[PDB]
Design a binder for this molecule. Sequence first.
Ligand SMILES: [Mg+2]
Ligand SMILES: [Mg+2]
Ligand SMILES: [Mg+2]
Ligand SMILES: [Mg+2]
Ligand SMILES: [Mg+2]
Ligand SMILES: [Mg+2]
Ligand SMILES: [Mg+2]
Ligand SMILES: [Mg+2]
Ligand SMILES: [Mg+2]
Ligand SMILES: [Mg+2]
Ligand SMILES: [Mg+2]
Ligand SMILES: [Mg+2]
Ligand SMILES: [Mg+2]
Ligand SMILES: [Mg+2]
Ligand SMILES: [Mg+2]
Ligand SMILES: [Mg+2]
Ligand SMILES: [Mg+2]
Ligand SMILES: [Mg+2]
Ligand SMILES: [Mg+2]
Ligand SMILES: [Mg+2]
Ligand SMILES: [Mg+2]
Ligand SMILES: [Mg+2]
Ligand SMILES: [Mg+2]
Ligand SMILES: [Mg+2]
Ligand SMILES: [Mg+2]
Ligand SMILES: [Mg+2]
Ligand SMILES: [Mg+2]
Ligand SMILES: [Mg+2]
Ligand SMILES: [Mg+2]
Ligand SMILES: [Mg+2]
Ligand SMILES: [Mg+2]
Ligand SMILES: [Mg+2]
Ligand SMILES: [Mg+2]
Ligand SMILES: [Mg+2]
Ligand SMILES: [Mg+2]
Ligand SMILES: [Mg+2]
Ligand SMILES: [Mg+2]
Ligand SMILES: [Mg+2]
Lengths: 116, 101, 70, 87
Amino acid sequence: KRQVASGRAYIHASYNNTIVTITDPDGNPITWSSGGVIGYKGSRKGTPYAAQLAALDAAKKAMAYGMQSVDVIVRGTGAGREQAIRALQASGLQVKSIVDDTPVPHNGCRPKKKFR
Amino acid sequence: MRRYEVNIVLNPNLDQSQLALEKEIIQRALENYGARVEKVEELGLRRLAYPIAKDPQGYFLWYQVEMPEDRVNDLARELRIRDNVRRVMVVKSQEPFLANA
Amino acid sequence: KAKVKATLGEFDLRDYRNVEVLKRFLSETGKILPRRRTGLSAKEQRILAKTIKRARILGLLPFTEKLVRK
Amino acid sequence: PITKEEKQKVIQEFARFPGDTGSTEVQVALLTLRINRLSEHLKVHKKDHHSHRGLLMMVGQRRRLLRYLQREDPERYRALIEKLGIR
RNA sequence: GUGGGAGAGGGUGGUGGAAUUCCCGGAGUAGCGGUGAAAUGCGCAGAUACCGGGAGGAACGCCGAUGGCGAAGGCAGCCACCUGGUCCACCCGUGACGCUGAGGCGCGAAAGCGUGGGGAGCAAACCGGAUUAGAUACCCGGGUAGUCCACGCCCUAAACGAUGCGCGCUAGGUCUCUGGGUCUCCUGGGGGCCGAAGCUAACGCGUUAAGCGCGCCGCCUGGGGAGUACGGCCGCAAGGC
Ligand SMILES: [Mg+2]
Ligand SMILES: [Mg+2]
Ligand SMILES: [Mg+2]
Ligand SMILES: [Mg+2]
Ligand SMILES: [Mg+2]
Ligand SMILES: [Mg+2]
Ligand SMILES: [Mg+2]
Ligand SMILES: [Mg+2]
Ligand SMILES: [Mg+2]
Ligand SMILES: [Mg+2]
Ligand SMILES: [Mg+2]
Ligand SMILES: [Mg+2]
Ligand SMILES: [Mg+2]
Ligand SMILES: [Mg+2]
Ligand SMILES: [Mg+2]
Ligand SMILES: [Mg+2]
Ligand SMILES: [Mg+2]
Ligand SMILES: [Mg+2]
Ligand SMILES: [Mg+2]
Ligand SMILES: [Mg+2]
Ligand SMILES: [Mg+2]
Ligand SMILES: [Mg+2]
Ligand SMILES: [Mg+2]
Ligand SMILES: [Mg+2]
Ligand SMILES: [Mg+2]
Ligand SMILES: [Mg+2]
Ligand SMILES: [Mg+2]
Ligand SMILES: [Mg+2]
Ligand SMILES: [Mg+2]
Ligand SMILES: [Mg+2]
Ligand SMILES: [Mg+2]
Ligand SMILES: [Mg+2]
Ligand SMILES: [Mg+2]
Ligand SMILES: [Mg+2]
Ligand SMILES: [Mg+2]
Ligand SMILES: [Mg+2]
Ligand SMILES: [Mg+2]
Ligand SMILES: [Mg+2]
């Protein structure tokens, strides 16, 4: 019941799944959603459709939580990283500024053999 | 001896007791380590790109100097021990290489 | 498009403290631009690099930023 | 490092006559200055191999200039040697 | 010699940011993860996603190149100090002081050994989940040595340009790094690409020779047995010559 008006939305996206997290303008979360949240089980989870549904779910949630205008930040890559974006757009939340935050490092950690 | 440029970036929230004090201890480290002073420019309060010591901005100083080479590293040991100074960068001078010239 | 040095005055390519200019050599994110877009040459670019990284340490030019749109 | 002062003092010291820069005596002394420098470098800094290689080549040089002198003036070479501490 | 120049050449102290992990805190539920699909695995002792703070190790995105330096192995954040090599210009100094180099001596990726540290990520062996007729593998989830540091050994390799070093000679064109010029261009010095003459069994090579010559060293003499056996040396061993 924090009744929060305008806020920020993190879209994290991997090849295995997607997750939206809605949060307050200083960053503490409000609701979150994912491919497992909505009914999806396996690989099926990282489809764009599930990303649509995920976004939409977290949108409905945050809206009944009192949201209106939203600033999006995107981390990651994989199918329907964009569908979550198209979703949040038409959600009824208003899209303020979409940003891309995907963290890349300056070469610190020796990646897993799968990733080299 | 050689010619260096000493950069200092220290906390912006000081007053003039503290500003006096820190600038004087800068002097002290130079006198002690034998660095004569060519110019000085105090750039002052400027907005950094990324936060240093959690701080969104900084207070900037530039001292062109000459000094005995071999102690420049200890000179920086001392300038760094100071708590209210969060960056020191000392560099030997270069001739002004131009471009679009 | 046009290169960077295509509009610029005579300027110290070794002077780190000057941000107004060095800034024109970064991208939408922090990343130093490639020769193609900075219109420099070998010794040129190669200097600009060290100039820039020197300024990044002094906290003037960013090590990175974020990207709008996307 | 080494500066033109240190240089000149040495040269002018070992000159066969005013102005000579390149005669054997001079090259050997100059050499020897730089040799003894690198000695003190690799006295600490023992982990520095590439500077060491450089110094090998350096001594092989001065030794070769000496072999030149000995087969040429036995005396000037003797004077050079005793003057510089060698052998 | 003097005057300039380029550089991830080396060594020592120092410091900067991104990321991973981990711990502290906040906020917030029911999943996260992972794959062709899956499961193991982690999550209600509250994970995942997010925000702030801390600790620690390793490696230095963009610049970065068909680039540079090095004798080779090899070398990449920034600063500083200690140092090696190399290039151009001047044409000043010595006056053949040269080349090569059996033997010796030192350097030599990785892995590997020893004593002492260190440990984030990765990861032989190992422990589990799968996939397949089976899985002793590829795919997944853990994980120890090790990878990092100090000192001391080991001395191998597709240590590859599969091309030993030095010098002289023999059309050009083109792209590039770095000096000097009266800077459309000329002139040194590195790096590539086409191609004269010539060479080659062909492929190809062609002023960075595999062309024309000279000097010196190394090495070869059908395949297997075999880089085995024996002997010697070296090595703590593994093992090397
Ligand atoms: Mg999945
Ligand atoms: Mg401090
Ligand atoms: Mg010189
Ligand atoms: Mg270096
Ligand atoms: Mg170094
Ligand atoms: Mg960190
Ligand atoms: Mg917690
Ligand atoms: Mg359980
Ligand atoms: Mg339990
Ligand atoms: Mg954090
Ligand atoms: Mg720890
Ligand atoms: Mg690249
Ligand atoms: Mg190689
Ligand atoms: Mg040098
Ligand atoms: Mg002459
Ligand atoms: Mg004469
Ligand atoms: Mg004669
Ligand atoms: Mg070795
Ligand atoms: Mg090793
Ligand atoms: Mg060990
Ligand atoms: Mg692992
Ligand atoms: Mg099985
Ligand atoms: Mg594995
Ligand atoms: Mg063969
Ligand atoms: Mg031959
Ligand atoms: Mg070379
Ligand atoms: Mg050429
Ligand atoms: Mg050519
Ligand atoms: Mg060809
Ligand atoms: Mg022909
Ligand atoms: Mg044919
Ligand atoms: Mg030739
Ligand atoms: Mg030849
Ligand atoms: Mg036989
Ligand atoms: Mg063998
Ligand atoms: Mg026998
Ligand atoms: Mg024995
Ligand atoms: Mg073996």
